[PDB]
Structure formats: structure tokens, C-alpha cells
Amino acid sequence: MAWNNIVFYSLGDVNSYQGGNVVITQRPQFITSWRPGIATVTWNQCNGPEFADGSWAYYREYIAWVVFPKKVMTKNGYPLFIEVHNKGSWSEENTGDNDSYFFLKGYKWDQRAFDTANLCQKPGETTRLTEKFDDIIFKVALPADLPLGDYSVTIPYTSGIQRHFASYLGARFKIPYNVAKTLPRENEMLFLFKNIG
Numbered sequence: 001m002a003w004n005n006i007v008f009y010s011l012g013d014v015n016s017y018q019g020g021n022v023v024i025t026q027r028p029q030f031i032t033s034w035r036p037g038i039a040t041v042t043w044n045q046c047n048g049p050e051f052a053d054g055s056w057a058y059y060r061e062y063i064a065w066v067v068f069p070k071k072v073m074t075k076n077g078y079p080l081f082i083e084v085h086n087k088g089s090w091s092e093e094n095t096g097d098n099d100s101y102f103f104l105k106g107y108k109w110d111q112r113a114f115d116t117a118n119l120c121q122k123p124g125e126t127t128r129l130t131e132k133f134d135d136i137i138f139k140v141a142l143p144a145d146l147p148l149g150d151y152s153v154t155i156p157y158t159s160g161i162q163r164h165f166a167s168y169l170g171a172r173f174k175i176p177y178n179v180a181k182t183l184p185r186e187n188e189m190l191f192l193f194k195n196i197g
């Protein structure tokens with residue numbers, strides 16, 4: 001009988017980027033990087049064995065995610081619009097969403113394994129994620145009506161790896177975008193720039 005275990009491992013990283021001096025018709029950029037690290041299970045869905053002892057085959061489908069806001073409000077109520085500049089090999093999906101960009105990288109599929117493993121780790125459990133993916137470069141559209149000077153903007157967002165283990169070849173599952181939208185946003189980009197007329 002068939003089973004599928006899917007576990008989302010969330011990375012919490014804090015980074016800053018200097019977007020340098022800009023006038024208000026320029027779109028300063030920032031680069032978000034994927035830093036291998038310790039991730040925490042923030043979601044799962046499982047109906048199969050929780051532990052592979054080594055004696056039997058299972059199949060892996062791994063997909064990295066980034067969920068990133070499309071707009072960032074300042075404390076006074078002004079919006080900063082977040083635009084894609086270069087997303088490398090990330091797949092930009094569910095583009096009609098009001099609020100959030102969804103970037104996916106499905107890098108492993110149909111891959112048979114016998115490796116002993118924990119196939120349904122529970123939320124709050126941690127593991128080390130060694131994988132590395134492309135940077136994403138964002139540009140920011142500043143408002144004409146927005147005011148001047150030095151700015152420091154904290155931007156929370158979600159990144160992590162979906163690991164899907166299945167009993168069969170050809171197994172496919174993608175975390176629904178509505179689920180990905182509401183996952184904990186454990187990363188932070190502190191974006192700095194100096195504004196001018």
C-alpha cells in the first residue's frame with residue numbers, strides 16, 4: 001500500500017545588503033543568498049513509515065522554496081514595491097497572487113534510496129541542510145511621494161526545502177501555494193539605502 005511523507009524544513013537566516021546612495025527614480029537592488037544551515041520543520045503531511053531502517057527502498061522528491069513579499073510597508077504607511085531582477089534558475093510560480101512571490105527549485109525526483117532516515121520529522125525538529133541554490137536579486141521601486149534620507153527596512157521571508165519521501169517511483173507532490181504562503185517567515189533581509197531628490 002502507497003504512502004507519501006512530505007516535510008518542510010525552514011531556514012532562518014539574517015542578512016543585510018547595502019543598496020548604496022539612490023535618487024528616487026532609481027531602483028536599488030538587493031541580493032538574497034541561500035546559506036546552508038540548520039532548518040526547522042514547520043509543516044508536514046505523512047501517512048507512511050516514520051523511520052527507514054536500511055532494509056527497504058523509498059523514493060525522494062526534493063523542492064526548494066522561497067516565499068517573498070511583493071510589497072513592504074514602512075511604519076508610517078508607505079509602500080515599497082519588490083521586483084524581480086534576476087532569479088537565476090528559480091521557477092517563479094503562482095504569479096497571480098496578490099501578496100507574495102513563490103520561487104521553486106525542484107532538484108531531485110524519482111530518486112530511489114535505502115539510506116536509513118527519519119521520514120516524517122515533527123514540527124520543531126531540526127536538521128542540517130547542505131544544499132546551495134542560486135541567489136535571487138530583487139530591485140525596489142521607491143515612491144515619488146515617499147520621503148528622503150537613510151532607510152533601514154527589515155524584510156521577513158520564508159525559505160527551505162520540501163522533502164517528499166514516497167513508497168513508489170513517479171511520486172509527485174508540491175506543497176500547495178496557500179500552505180507555503182502561511183509558513184513561518186524565518187529569514188530576514190535588512191535592506192539599507194540612502195535616498196535623495
Ligand SMILES: CC(=O)N[C@H]1[C@H](O[C@H]2[C@@H](O)[C@@H](CO)O[C@H](O[C@@H]3[C@H](O)[C@@H](O)[C@H](O[C@H]4[C@H](O)[C@@H](O)[C@H](O)O[C@@H]4CO)O[C@@H]3CO)[C@@H]2O)O[C@H](CO)[C@H](O)[C@@H]1O[C@@H]1O[C@H](CO)[C@H](O)[C@H](O)[C@H]1O
Binds near residue numbers: 062104172174
Ligand atoms: C507536474 C507539475 O507540477 N508541473 C508543474 C511544474 O511543477 C514543477 C516545478 O515547480 C519545478 C520547479 O523547479 O519543480 C518540480 O519539477 C521537478 C523538476 O524541476 C522537473 O524538471 C522535473 O520534470 C521531469 C519530470 O518529473 C519527468 O517526468 C520528465 O520525464 O522529465 C521532466 C524534465 O526532467 O519534475 C521534477 C518533479 O519534482 C515541479 O513538479 O511547475 C510548472 C510551473 O513552473 C507548472 O505549474 C507545471 O504544471 C504544468 O504546466 C503546464 C504548461 O503550462 C500545464 O499547465 C500542465 O497542465 C501542468 O501540469
